[PDB]
Structure 1
Amino acid sequence: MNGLVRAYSETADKQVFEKDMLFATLETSVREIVLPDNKQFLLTDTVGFVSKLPHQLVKAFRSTLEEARDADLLIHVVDYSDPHYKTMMKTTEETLKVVGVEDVPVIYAYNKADLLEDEMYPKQTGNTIIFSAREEESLEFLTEVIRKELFASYEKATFLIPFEAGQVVAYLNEHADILETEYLENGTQIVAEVSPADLQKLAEY
């Protein structure tokens, strides 16, 4: 989270509490992530899990994971460096089922790659992703994986916007990825990756 807020937040002054203790975070955070192309998602960081979690605490957890169950994407982070990670991962999934996280696109990110010497930093194998949260290259890569799963419906389209309605050029500079910006005598012609929601609004162009 902190990594993606440094890189890809309009207000990069605000990082979450990180430390080498058990249950560092106990309250969900939500942070706006704006990609360098201008695609926008929210990144949410939850409570951690731990084996044999009291069946009473589990009832309380359900309220925190309310955003995760309602999430568009689910990014499961595992500590790859630790020996018992297949043990940790299965214990996590079993908990998520009890919480009520069902039928949500999952991505099994394996973290703390730097602690190993054999494995390379950024790698992908379907849902599997090897990376180091400390490193920027890792995040730039995780960012790309998110942009593949969320913004698929984003397709390319051509627009011709007269000079009198500049405001529409600003909208395309702010709410869509511009590939090329062409200029004619009649008006401005701009071809971009936009959403279906934008292909209703700018339809006249």
Structure 2
Amino acid sequence: EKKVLIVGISQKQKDFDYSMEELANLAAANNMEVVGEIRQNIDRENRATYVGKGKVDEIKGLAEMQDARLIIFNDELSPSQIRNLEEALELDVMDRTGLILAIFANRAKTKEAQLQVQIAKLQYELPRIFGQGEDMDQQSGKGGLSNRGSGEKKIETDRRTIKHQIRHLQKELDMLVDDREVRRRKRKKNEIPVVSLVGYTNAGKSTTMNGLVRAYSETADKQVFEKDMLFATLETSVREIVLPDNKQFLLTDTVGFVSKLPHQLVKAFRSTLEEARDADLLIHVVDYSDPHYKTMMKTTEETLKVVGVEDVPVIYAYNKADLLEDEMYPKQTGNTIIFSAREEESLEFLTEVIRKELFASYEKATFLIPFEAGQVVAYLNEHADILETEYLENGTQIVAEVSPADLQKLAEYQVA
């Protein structure tokens, strides 16, 4: 495990004590031993070193007396700040932006995600080509009037050759959207309602789905990855849930997300967060035990705003209510639920909640199905919830709560 160091400044932030300990957890995930940490209270970042010429001395001092090799900075660095910090430390440096890119590149097990990481990582290098251009300009070849060589300057050329790779990945990533819409064709051709779980990382998202599947799914042997790791899930998964009274819907998962996320990964997120934009309901799971939960909501709602997830009704779910002392879960107030995704009751209570938003238009009805030719009695007993059935001599009178698309699909069999 590599030994690294953690550096950051205040610069008018409001959770500098919290945004500094994420960078410890983000470093643990990338398999680095955080040896020490540096904090400086300043109002604005330095234009040349990000910390001011003073503290550059005691990062060099501290990394020499702690055997560090890499320095992580809590915020993204300008190309010039990177250039100046290198020479002043003669050590590898890395900002927070590249720390997620190191996390995502090691946990992308599909080219769906692998292409998106790689295009975003290439857009990061384009501004740094200048510093690469500056150092490579020492051996400029020099001279003057050549009359027999090349076109423009070297800085023009090496900028063109890196933009060329970007547009190629853009073409490949554009064709990715066409592929994913083919797999949604059956869902969209029908009108199966879809509800998408969202929320901060380690909120209890997978734990919820893996419970609603083991209880109300025909193929219960289709579980998901629930663990203690940060960023366990990095994909969307769909599962068909069928309630005991013969109602069906689709439950989707989502990759969790953290604050200070690079703006060139949200463009990749925009693709992977498509199931939520078309969701007809959202479940916002929040880590209720952490006192930093109120701040967790803000960073996730300001993130759904970027990708176009809006106007979908939301129900806020507060997980981990077992840990809180004297908590009488489950309980519902407003659009808010208190539960723990471990007991069946919370999961049995949650399912009865969603039924109100999705299936509220299924109204009472009656029908008369002749015995001689049936094959509709089966249909009622699947696409409805029978209450009572009166097997008569004329045939089979039935009473059931059928969908509005089944009233007029069976408008001839209905009786008074």
Task: Classify the TM-score, shorter chain.
Answer: over 0.9
Match of 1:71 in 2: 279
Query: What is the CA deviation profile of residues 5-61 of structure 1, one whole-angstrom value per residue up to 9, with x for unaligned ones?
Result: 000001101111000111111110000000000011000011112111111111111
The 2-side partners of 1:30 and 1:202 are apart by 31
> Alpha carbons of 1:185 and 1:64: their partners in 2 closer, same or farther (altered >3 Å)?
same
Counterpart selection for 1:26 from 234, 238, 252 = 234
Cα distance in 2 between the residues matched to 1:147 and 1:126: 16
Instruction: Please state whether the residue corresponding to 2:231 is helix, strand or coil.
Output: coil
- 1:141 aligns to what? 349
| 1:69-99 CA-partner distances (Å, limit 9, x unpaired) | 1001110000101111111011111000011
In structure 1, the residue corresponding to 2:408 is in which secondary structure?
A: helix
Alignment partner of 1:153: what SS?
coil
Q: What aligned pairs does 1:159-198 form with structure 2 within 5 A after superposition?
A: 159-198=367-406
1:119 CA drift (Å): 1.5
TM-score, normalized by length of structure 2?
0.49
Distance 1:189 1:83, change over 3 A: same
Q: TM-score, normalised by structure 1?
A: 0.98
Greater C-alpha Rg:
2
Greater percentage in helix: 2
Shift of 1:166: 2.2
Match of 1:201 in 2: 409
What is the SS of the residue equivalent to 2:255? Answer: coil
State the alpha-carbon separation in 2 of the partners of residues 201 and 45 from structure 1.
33
**Structure 1 residues 97 and 181, CA gap change in structure 2 (3 angstroms):** same
Equivalence for 2:329: 121
CA–CA separation in structure 2 for the residues paired with 1:181 and 1:23: 51
| Alpha-carbon distance, 1:165 to partner | 3.0
**Secondary structure of 2:397's match?**
strand
In structure 1, list runs of 5 or more residues that go unmatched: none
Q: Secondary structure at the match of 2:322?
A: helix
Runs of 4 or more consecutive aligned structure 1 residues displaced over 2 Å after TM superposition: none
For residues 156-181 of structure 1, give each alpha carbon's deviation from its aligned partner in whole angstroms, at most 9, with x where no partner exists: 11111111332101011111111112
| In 2: Cα distance, 1:40 partner to 1:174 partner | 10
Write the distance in 2 (CA, Å) between the matches of 1:115 and 1:181.
Answer: 47
- Structure 2 distance, partners of 1:55, 1:7, is 39
Distance 1:140 1:192 in 2: 23
Q: Of Structure 1 and Structure 2, which has the larger fraction of its residues in strand? A: 1
CA distance in 1, matches of 2:303, 2:236: 17
CA RMSD of aligned residues (A): 0.9
Partner of 1:81: 289
* Farther-moved stretch of structure 1 (160-169 vs 30-39): 160-169
Uncovered stretches (5+) of structure 2, i.e. residues with no partner: 1-208
Query: Aligned partners of 1:183 and 1:117: how far apart in 2?
Result: 55
Deviates more, 1:57-66 or 1:158-167: 158-167
Query: How far apart in 1 are the matches of 2:373 and 2:316?
Result: 46
Q: Which has the higher contact order (CA 8 A, sep 6+)?
A: 1
